[PDB]
């Protein structure tokens, strides 16, 4: 990793044992769950592509998910090369070369090249770019390995409203849509898919009511 | 270890209780699995040949593999001596000798000499060289102690596709065959050894399909 | 066909009886065998598209192949027209017309036109072009009418090694797979798919043993 | 092949149907009997390397023997590249490129280079070098496919010397033995592996005897 100190001083560090051991346990304990992304992002602050390829490689098992992420990286890598044209003839020996897709995945680049590109000012943020690819592929696995749909979440005859809304906003987080489609699921489905007893209560509040007013209202049902 | 700090301040330190433990537990819990080789690499950041022999000697048992790994480390060491001539090194009174293969493998060399080579201007990475030679030897153990053949991976009658793709790409990872060979394994076997129910579906997509299109294809099957 | 005489006098000749009989007999004995394809080029060296149409149209039966071939050629023909569009505005006065894909397949081009393009300097080789489309399409046919997988070729409990190496490389010859993968099939599969007794024989030579060494070693097991 | 007509006039022509067919039928009928190699040399008078590949690729059947011959052809090719390195820069003014092993074997080179090499002054006889490499691998096939060694040729009790001597001078014909050594094999083995009656008569002739003197002596035996 590389640690920024006082005055914008960036100095390289060995990867700590407990960053390693916490990162494996997060993938053992919660597998490919939505909250696992933030746990990844947090644990991976200030990492290089060598440190990131390491975190990915230190995962044993999961090779179907690690392989779906390899294609995604390779497609992104091909996509980075298409959008960013390959240089011709001379490249300045005084100024470091622009990274290729294979360089962003750490495949064709050195640790010193990764360090030049992050430490240099303006930087080329290879750590943060490749992490964004990684997060891109993690969504594809997370969504896939969760067999969920927000439309099949309903409240049972005796189910506490608070638990049905917990289930709803648990299911909704893993759904892939625009914010407007999500906003619409919120204003439409939450009341629709509430129970007959609860359904009368929320329709009597009208569609102007907040999530709080609805949550203390339907508490005893 | 030798940790390089800010302004290139290089300071020797002794191998930590949690470094020691992590590496001991990694071999106890995960033995010679694939994921051990990047973890080994991680935990051995700033490692001198003494720090590397320590990690290897602090493991109890695994001594058939540790004997295999010693012949291999002796082979890479004899190879290193063969390539580079026996010579005194820098002939100033204040300077350390020029390392042999047996010095890199830590047999004929002292901790201060090892510290000398690594801090040396211009640096000789005797620690990392010996880690590559150990990784080369771990890999021969890891491939041999892996029970499966990729030619025996096929999906069962009521078996979920996803668990199968995990076994194929777990087994494929542990195989030494080239990228062109490994791409042929993907384009042929994966589709081929699928059960009748999914087999008909994957054939209906055409042979252009991605692993993603197969997994969404077989998500109900 | 067109026969090039001394000093390069190219004059067209009538399609020879033993050209006609040779190609007829060849198809009668060897059908969809891989050996048809070099024979096809050898017997068509110096041909026009008229002559290539004669040999294909003089084939009785095999009409599934002739439709597959026909389709392959129209695809190749459609593509030749996509990449090579006809020039803007008025024609050069002395020159010969632009061959279109159907001209090249001899569909829309007379005998004289086909002779002009071939003999004109610089030559447009409508004959050799049509042959690669015909060979591409023939390789698909050959491969389709081949059924056995190369994984399915194994030595019988007391089968002569030779009769299995013959089966192995006969089936290998009709595999689509890149050369490096066919090299991988050679090194893995051959010794692997041998019977307990021959397997043992080969295993005693050590794994460096050349095919001459494998064949003399299993000369009698 | 390339026909030399009146006054150094070299003219290209196609490989003849009835040539090609003669070769396929000799191999179909007679496989790899010793007379097959002289037949192959007889049938390829003025053949290019291309024409020589045409003849190997038109063999169907016997692909372990054909494999053995490719490997031999790669050995003979690699040795040509060892003895004579690559010739740097762009080809010498009005001079032909010195061929690689892969050029003699007809792969990296084009038919027009092959016709130039053969027809140029000084000529490069690429056709006859490759033909020796093929004749060498046909001899490995002949010798390997043989069931009896010259040590193993022996006379029956009531067997005519003449019929036995026919098995001996056939077996001697396929030996890779040198000529001074084949001469010992004649003056030693022929009588020694004779029946006791014909042996006695032939020993009585002394060591000066011809094959004729030996056949006319054991005429009545």
């Amino acid at each position: 990793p590389i640690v920024q100190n006082l005055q914008g001083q960036m100095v390289h560090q060995a990867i700590s044992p407990r960053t390693l051991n916490a990162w494996v346990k997060v993938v053992e304990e919660k597998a490919f769950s939505p909250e696992v992304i933030p746990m990844f992002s947090a644990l991976s602050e200030g990492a290089t592509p060598q440190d990131l390829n390491t975190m990915l490689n230190t995962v044993g098992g999961h090779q179907a998910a690690m392989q779906m992420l390899k294609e995604t990286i390779n497609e992104e890598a091909a996509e980075w090369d298409r959008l960013h044209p390959v240089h011709a003839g001379p490249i300045a020996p005084g100024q470091m070369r622009e990274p290729r897709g294979s360089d962003i995945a750490g495949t064709t680049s050195t640790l010193q090249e990764q360090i030049g590109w992050m430490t240099h000012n303006p930087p080329i943020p290879v750590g943060e770019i490749y992490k964004r690819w990684i997060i891109l592929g993690l969504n594809k696995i997370v969504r896939m390995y969760s067999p969920t749909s927000i439309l099949d979440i309903r409240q049972g005859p005796k189910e506490p409203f608070r638990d049905y809304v917990d289930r709803f906003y648990k299911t909704l987080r893993a759904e892939q849509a625009s914010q407007e489609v999500k906003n619409w699921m919120t204003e439409t489905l939450l009341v629709q898919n509430a129970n007959p007893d609860c359904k009368t209560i929320l329709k009597a509040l009208g569609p102007g009511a907040t999530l709080e007013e609805m949550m203390t209202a339907c508490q005893g049902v």
Side-chain angles (χ1 to χ4, degrees), chain A:
Chain A
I2 317 182
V3 181
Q4 183 184 228
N5 295 3
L6 178 54
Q7 303 320 120
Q9 295 202 104
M10 295 265 263
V11 62
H12 199 275
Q13 293 287 271
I15 178 69
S16 199
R18 200 169 186 202
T19 292
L20 297 149
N21 199 2
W23 159 255
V24 183
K25 300 302 164 177
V26 160
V27 182
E28 283 172 47
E29 294 185 10
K30 284 154 172 282
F32 302 75
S33 199
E35 84 277 6
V36 178
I37 297 176
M39 294 170 191
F40 172 85
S41 194
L43 293 161
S44 56
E45 287 299 304
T48 54
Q50 165 57 358
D51 302 307
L52 301 163
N53 275 325
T54 299
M55 290 176 73
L56 306 175
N57 292 346
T58 309
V59 186
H62 298 313
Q63 305 295 298
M66 282 296 137
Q67 186 57 7
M68 280 199 289
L69 185 49
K70 295 169 182 55
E71 289 296 294
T72 303
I73 289 178
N74 281 6
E75 282 193 69
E76 283 315 297
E79 186 68 350
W80 182 273
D81 284 341
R82 175 188 82 79
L83 286 152
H84 303 140
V86 184
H87 286 252
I91 289 184
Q95 300 178 41
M96 35 69 185
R97 77 200 161 78
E98 272 179 284
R100 295 333 312 143
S102 51
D103 295 318
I104 294 304
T107 316
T108 56
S109 53
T110 72
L111 179 46
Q112 302 321 114
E113 292 192 306
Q114 293 157 29
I115 291 166
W117 285 324
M118 288 146 76
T119 65
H120 187 268
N121 185 22
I124 311 181
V126 296
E128 289 146 76
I129 297 173
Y130 180 40
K131 159 178 191 156
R132 256 149 46 222
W133 294 3
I134 287 160
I135 296 160
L136 213 73
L138 279 173
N139 279 273
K140 296 179 178 192
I141 302 155
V142 169
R143 287 164 185 163
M144 181 89 66
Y145 283 8
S146 187
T148 39
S149 176
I150 184 70
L151 302 141
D152 293 329
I153 321 288
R154 313 190 180 70
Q155 186 177 355
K158 290 209 289 291
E159 177 175 351
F161 182 76
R162 289 89 180 268
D163 291 0
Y164 155 63
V165 181
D166 245 332
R167 277 152 76 249
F168 183 106
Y169 292 100
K170 173 172 200 177
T171 295
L172 188 65
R173 189 202 175 147
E175 282 290 312
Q176 163 49 331
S178 60
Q179 193 40 79
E180 169 142 312
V181 161
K182 284 189 169 178
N183 291 346
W184 172 95
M185 285 151 179
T186 289
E187 271 179 72
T188 301
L189 308 182
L190 189 161
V191 178
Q192 170 53 228
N193 299 322
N195 81 6
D197 292 309
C198 210
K199 194 173 303 176
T200 63
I201 295 157
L202 310 174
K203 284 310 190 178
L205 310 167
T210 59
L211 195 47
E212 300 195 291
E213 296 158 54
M214 282 201 262
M215 287 283 277
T216 196
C218 199
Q219 61 183 22
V221 178

